[PDB]
Ligand binder design. Structure first.
Ligand SMILES: CCCc1cc(=O)n2nc(NCc3ccc(Br)cc3)nc2[nH]1
Ligand SMILES: CCCc1cc(=O)n2nc(NCc3ccc(Br)cc3)nc2[nH]1
Ligand SMILES: *Cc1c(COP(=O)(O)O)cnc(C)c1O
Ligand SMILES: *Cc1c(COP(=O)(O)O)cnc(C)c1O
Lengths: 354, 357
């Protein structure tokens, strides 16, 4: 079964917080309301939109002992006409449910949750900024809530959603084979809390070595998997002399991003160059770099969208990536086309109106 | 800048809770808990307070990015009604390593242990004394940053709860599913730390084991199908090796193995006896198979705090059920291990492994 948006209960706030006047630091500023839905042996209770408030959790809650937790991330955008739209939200709903099944957490109806999320954004519509490059970040979470120390499928769970208003400079990456984000047969291809905790120390290491993000390598052939919490793309002339955009395939160690899929879809549509999903090795990159075949390297993801890379520290070898000296033409094109779609300049099936 | 047991604040429950009389593991809790807060002004004062819910910001990094780690150790009440913790220093060592791995705040292991001692003291009447019973102690350290950025927490909570637990068993053996598709941990990963993130993903695997008529998961690693762990327990094999020497083998701490306190204790006990080879070496399924055909395997078992020492009698590997003659061999080793541990844990023999409350 599932909760229904028709059963939504609304509790407007009586202490509305002051909106930001000024820099928006990602994921630190929250809106006045939140979605909340509980599950137990009776199934799903009724969804409610209520004032933003703390969670109350039993000390034995399995969300805190055995990381029975998963999350999502998507953006709503306000056009000049003040119309708010969510970017490809159905894909997040699909991904959220796959995550839930992987952690033996309760299933729900994707279209019911999306509607609840729509209602929640509608209540807080004034929190959605409209300055250029600004958006509203939507964070759905599902956690197990069993008050028991046995490692087991939970009999209670909690689904909730909070919102943040959020506000092109290239980055350097540390590429060290010692660090492993995920493995074939693991859970790196699901957006589960457990995949993130262990990266915090690796990210501090990147900073100490003068880099900004982590380029996650995998396997004997040092495959480029992902960059920070973003998917990685390479625009180059491949060894066979063909110009292509390549990103790693979904073989278990890649989180299937929405921006990622969107970029593949966009480039495939254009039909101007080869667009493939194939592994990428450091060996291939060094060679392509020495032969001037790399045009652009970039990460993709909701929070930072499409972010260029200019440097990769591979062990002690400091490699210049000429992304910015190549425009970066593809990056700009993607950003321009995405911006048109996102802010309702060009109406498109990808957008879901709030 | 650790918290201090000298600075403990105590707050006794207004209305105590009625003890149990059928104790299911990890469901029943005691009257009090320990709680310590950390922030940019460091650690606050530890406190003992009535058992109560946590209040967390909905953005808490503990729930979004699994900034969470735990421990598990037992306290036992002997005939003399004295209560003792089994080798708690090892759990404190392990917890601090977990903390560091997750960039969570460092603390003083002896201060924490004194606070746990004070906490068990306060609830000492909850520690049962029937044969096979103990008190399970569950310390937890979680991140508590109200931010969606994946980052080093500037806030944290350290708490400890207690559960009286009953006799899990005479030893009843289990069946295992050995399917290499399921990978618990990877070299360079965090499988060797007691982090919450390592457990969530195993819930589905365990259901699959139950669907296929097995009771626990035998976690295999690498192209040569190394036996690493069984469920949430370390794995031991008692056999005559390929060189003709009777040995007790357990996989070494190469990164994909959680260094159990019971595991180390079985190694320490077996070495002290001096009666057979005691070694830490990779065990492959190919090795176990050849040893099972040539009749060289005596016993296979799991080691861990919750279930102490658990016999295995069947492994389902490549759709073929392999029989493990553990029970036919006594199981002598297991029974000897269980007896000595019991004597030590319940104070029958004095031993430096036990820490009095
Ligand atoms: C994670 C520490 C607390 C804990 C939870 C839990 O579910 N289990 N289950 C076991 N043992 C089950 C088991 C029995 C025999 C073999 Br062989 C392997 C596993 N121990 C804990 N501990
Ligand atoms: C996990 C979803 C929310 C989230 C958290 C977070 O910390 N980050 N950081 C990034 N991007 C940083 C970055 C910048 C450039 C490159 Br190339 C790679 C990563 N995105 C999120 N999202
Ligand atoms: C969320 C995420 C991405 C990309 O996600 P989008 O769906 O494009 O926002 C990539 N990699 C990791 C590790 C992530 O957590
Ligand atoms: C806790 C744990 C062990 C060892 O447990 P001890 O109680 O310290 O002996 C072994 N394996 C896994 C997966 C664990 O979580």
């Amino acid at each position: 079964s599932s909760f229904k948006a028709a059963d939504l209960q609304l509790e407007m706030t009586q202490k509305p917080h002051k909106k930001p006047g000024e820099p928006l630091v990602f994921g630190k500023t929250f809106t006045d309301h939140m979605l909340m839905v509980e599950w137990n042996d009776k199934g799903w209770g009724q969804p409610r939109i209520q004032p933003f408030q703390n969670l109350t959790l039993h000390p034995a809650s399995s969300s805190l002992h055995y990381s029975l937790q998963l999350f999502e991330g998507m953006k709503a955008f306000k056009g000049k006409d003040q119309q708010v739209r969510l970017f490809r939200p159905w894909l997040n709903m699909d991904r959220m449910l796959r995550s839930a099944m992987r952690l033996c957490l309760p299933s729900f109806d994707k279209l019911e949750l999306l509607e609840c999320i729509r209602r929640l954004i509608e209540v807080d519509k004034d929190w959605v900024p409209d300055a250029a490059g600004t958006s509203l970040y939507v964070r759905p979470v599902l956690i197990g809530n069993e008050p028991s120390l046995g490692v087991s499928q939970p009999t209670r769970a909690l689904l909730f959603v909070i919102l943040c208003p959020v506000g092109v400079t290239p980055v350097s990456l540390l590429a060290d084979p010692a660090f492993i984000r995920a493995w074939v047969g693991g859970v790196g291809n699901y957006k589960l809390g457990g995949n993130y905790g262990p990266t915090v120390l690796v990210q501090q290491e990147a900073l100490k070595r003068g880099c900004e993000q982590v380029l996650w390598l995998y396997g004997p052939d040092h495959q480029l998997t992902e960059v920070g919490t973003m998917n990685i793309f390479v625009y180059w002339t491949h060894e066979d002399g063909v110009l292509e955009l390549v990103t790693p395939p979904l073989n278990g160690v890649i989180l299937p991003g929405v921006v990622r899929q969107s970029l593949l879809d966009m480039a495939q549509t254009w039909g101007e160059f080869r667009v493939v999903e194939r592994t990428i090795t450091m060996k291939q990159l060094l060679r392509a770099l020495e032969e001037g075949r790399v045009r652009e390297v970039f990460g993709s993801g909701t929070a930072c969208q499409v972010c260029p890379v200019h440097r990769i520290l591979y062990k002690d070898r400091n490699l210049h990536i000429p992304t910015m000296e190549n425009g970066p033409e593809l990056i700009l094109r993607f950003q321009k086309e995405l911006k048109e779609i996102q802010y309702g300049i060009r109406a498109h099936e990808w957008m879901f109106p709030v």
